[PDB]
Write a protein that binds this ligand. Structure first.
Ligand SMILES: CC(=O)N[C@@H]1[C@@H](O)[C@H](O)[C@@H](CO)O[C@H]1O
Ligand SMILES: *[C@@H]1O[C@H](CO)[C@@H](O)[C@H](O)[C@H]1NC(C)=O
Ligand SMILES: *[C@@H]1O[C@H](CO)[C@@H](O)[C@H](O)[C@H]1NC(C)=O
Ligand SMILES: *[C@@H]1O[C@H](CO)[C@@H](O)[C@H](O)[C@H]1NC(C)=O
Ligand SMILES: *[C@@H]1O[C@H](CO)[C@@H](O)[C@H](O)[C@H]1NC(C)=O
Ligand SMILES: *[C@@H]1O[C@H](CO)[C@@H](O)[C@H](O)[C@H]1NC(C)=O
Lengths: 18, 164, 49, 290, 147
């Protein structure tokens, strides 16, 4: 999934979804 | 076609506590020297010395009445050290008129100048003027009952001023 | 009380002067080293001012 | 295997006044012979706190679900260590992260997982027939744990776990707070000798442990230890007794306190600046004598 | 004229800089993930959570036991003192010719159908030869990857 930028500052928006 | 054992490392910040961190370095302890200390959460300058305080086990910092850091616990040792500010003060030049002589005496105010003839007084210490046991009227005020004058083939003397 | 009040007034003035050093005055932080290290000089100049 | 507990008589909770209680160290800074004004979440002086009781005599076994506005001051006037741990979270349906603290018969367990908590979680202590002693025999706290973010287990230890028939002789105090994802716990133990009512005096709660968790702490729930034996036959829903136990719950509010530090750096007294005008004078003058 | 005048402000300068940090004892379990006897397949790559510990990337960079050490979004010598909330370590076996495809913006069979990195992926990648451990006489068939 893709997360909003307001929640993650350094890392990428994409997170584990498997 | 050789198999390669690969590892993928991913890092991210989630406006959350920094659970993972890296160390910078560590140095040996230095006492009775004006140094720039670095600790768990404070940086600055001062003179560290062995103390006799009673920090609580959960406490690590010290503060005086004016909310200035006083003592800091050692991160690697259960030892607590006072912080004394590095010595400072004004430099006052004690001279007669330039038409009289070019010899000057220097007063390093409010410093124990074993750290900087030499005469130690309550207003600092007077360098360049000799101390005498005689008493005269105050010519050049210095403080704490000490005055200086250009007398005796001539020099600057430091005496205890006579009231009358 | 006259002499004690003179001493107390001078002590209070000095203590307030010292405590005024812990105020942000609209800056990010009161500690000068903190603002120096956290941000680059060309932007931290306004906070230092 | 989650189970429900029946045969419980519901009654309005009692109330008790906090006589200068709930004061803790706001920071790790040492101060000696000074008076400090701190703006922190404190328990207001002389405030009514909900009293929960547990006794058989009536089948009194109190463990409701309570809100978590900004903090909780927890006390426990116990003689046999019946109250064990607390469970936190927002929904407790495995959809949101939940925090669990349990001091079982072996170790204290602190973990954060998306638990599926039971409707009436508890701990089961059974008086077995093989040996004449009391020990834990049931674990009916949660149901499932899909994933865990933090889990800590301390070193093994033992406790009496015996249901003394005397009066309360130990007092345990706890303060729970959470700001910017930091879960903070303060505690202190004070010897007491009383039957009921909160004892007087002053006690400053030293910090114990700080937990970086970062959840939504919407509410919480407490736990106890249940006594089950062949002397009280029954199923898992009614064949149980609570024993002589009691605890109090107090909520923290944003207040300003004037803390007093002695020569050795221990908080000895405090003043609630919003209690009465005399305390306002004491706080304004930054002194205890006016 | 004759008298006493204040001219300067004497102060003792600091002799040197001293740094003290807490004892290093909560080291991250990087020695286990990097030295595990067996690893998961490409299509079923395992994810390891690393948190609440101190990490040392300087020793890994200077270990010289890794054939490839590429960092994206951060300098390899800059994250030593930097802090992260969570650390994810994905480890699996990749063919020698396929090691170049483990990067953001890459296209391939494994990249598109087995493991896809984000276009804005950040972190570092680790790679070293494993022919002496992951290969055996007669052929090793314990590794599966989707096609
Ligand atoms: C990780 C965590 O504890 N998150 C929040 C906490 O910060 C907050 O104070 C509380 C209020 O309901 O809800 C929860
Ligand atoms: C920190 O590590 C050093 C390493 O020898 C040790 O001497 C010291 O005792 C440790 N600190 C504490 C508080 O034990
Ligand atoms: C100044 O230093 C001398 C050491 O030369 C010491 O004996 C004396 O006590 C010191 N005085 C003060 C006020 O620190
Ligand atoms: C002053 O007198 C003291 C003893 O009273 C003596 O020790 C010192 O040397 C004398 N100094 C001078 C300059 O005469
Ligand atoms: C307990 O009773 C409540 C009442 O509605 C019910 O929702 C819950 O599922 C019950 N749990 C068990 C374990 O029987
Ligand atoms: C502080 O500690 C000293 C050390 O013995 C003790 O004598 C004194 O009574 C203590 N102060 C208290 C308990 O207020």
């Amino acid at each position: 999934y893709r997360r909003p930028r307001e929640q993650i500052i350094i890392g990428s928006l994409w997170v584990f979804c498997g | 076609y050789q198999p390669y054992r690969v590892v993928v490392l991913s890092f991210e910040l989630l406006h959350a506590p920094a659970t993972v961190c890296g160390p910078k370095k560590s140095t040996n302890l230095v006492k009775n020297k004006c140094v720039n200390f670095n600790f768990n959460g404070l940086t600055g300058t001062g003179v560290l010395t062995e103390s006799n305080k009673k920090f609580l086990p959960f406490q690590q910092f010290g503060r005086d009445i004016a909310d200035t850091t006083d003592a800091v616990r050692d991160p690697q040792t259960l030892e607590i050290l006072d912080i004394t500010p590095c010595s400072f003060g004004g430099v006052s030049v004690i001279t007669p008129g330039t038409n009289t002589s070019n010899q000057v005496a220097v007063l390093y105010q409010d410093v124990n100048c074993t750290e900087v003839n030499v005469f130690q007084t309550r207003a600092g210490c007077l360098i360049g003027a000799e101390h005498v046991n005689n008493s005269y009227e105050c010519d050049i005020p210095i403080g704490a009952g000490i005055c200086a004058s250009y007398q005796t083939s001539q020099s600057i003397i430091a005496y205890t001023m006579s009231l009358g | 009380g006259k002499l004690q009040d003179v001493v107390n007034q001078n002590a209070q003035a000095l203590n307030t002067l010292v405590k005024q050093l812990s105020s942000n005055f609209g800056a990010i932080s009161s500690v000068l080293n903190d603002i120096l290290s956290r941000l680059d000089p060309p932007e931290a100049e306004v906070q230092i001012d | 295997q989650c189970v429900n507990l029946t045969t419980r008589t519901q009654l309005p909770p009692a109330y008790t006044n906090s006589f200068t209680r709930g004061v803790y160290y706001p920071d790790k800074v040492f101060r000696s012979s000074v008076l400090h004004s701190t703006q922190d979440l404190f328990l207001p002086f002389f405030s009514n706190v909900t009293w929960f009781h547990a006794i058989h005599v009536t089948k009194r076994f109190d463990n409701p679900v309570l809100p978590f506005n900004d903090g909780v001051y927890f006390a426990s006037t116990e003689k046999s260590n019946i109250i064990r741990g607390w469970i936190f979270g927002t929904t407790l349906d495995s959809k949101t992260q939940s925090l669990l603290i349990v001091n079982n018969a072996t170790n204290v367990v602190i973990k954060v997982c998306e638990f599926q908590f039971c409707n009436d979680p508890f701990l089961g202590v059974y008086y077995h027939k093989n040996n004449k002693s009391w020990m834990e025999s049931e674990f009916r706290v949660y149901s499932s744990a899909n994933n865990c973010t933090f889990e800590y287990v301390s070193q093994p230890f033992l406790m009496d776990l015996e249901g003394k028939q005397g009066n309360f002789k130990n007092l345990r105090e706890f303060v729970f707070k959470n700001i910017d994802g930091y879960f903070k716990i303060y505690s202190k133990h004070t010897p007491i000798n009383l039957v009921r009512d909160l004892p007087q005096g002053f006690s400053a709660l030293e910090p114990l442990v700080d937990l970086p968790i970062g959840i939504n702490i919407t509410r919480f729930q407490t736990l106890l230890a249940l006594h089950r034996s062949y002397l009280t036959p029954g199923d898992s829903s009614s064949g149980w007794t609570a024993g002589a136990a009691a605890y109090y719950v107090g909520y923290l509010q944003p207040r300003t306190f004037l803390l007093k530090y002695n020569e050795n750096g221990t908080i000895t007294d405090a003043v609630d600046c919003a209690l009465d005008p005399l305390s306002e004078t004491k706080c304004t003058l930054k002194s205890f004598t006016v | 004229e004759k008298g006493i005048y204040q001219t300067s402000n004497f102060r003792v300068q600091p002799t040197e800089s001293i740094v003290r940090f807490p004892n290093i004892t909560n080291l991250c379990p990087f020695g286990e993930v990097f030295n595990a006897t067996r690893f998961a397949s490409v299509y079923a790559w395992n994810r390891k959570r690393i948190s609440n510990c101190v990490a040392d990337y300087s020793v890994l960079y200077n270990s010289a036991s890794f054939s490839t050490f590429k960092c994206y979004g951060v300098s390899p010598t800059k994250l030593n003192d930097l802090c992260f909330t969570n650390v994810y370590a994905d480890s699996f076996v990749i063919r020698g010719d396929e090691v170049r495809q483990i990067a953001p913006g890459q296209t391939g069979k494994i990249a598109d159908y087995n493991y896809k990195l984000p276009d804005d992926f950040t972190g570092c990648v680790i790679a070293w030869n494993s022919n002496n451990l992951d290969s055996k006489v007669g052929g090793n068939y314990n590794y599966l990857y989707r096609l």
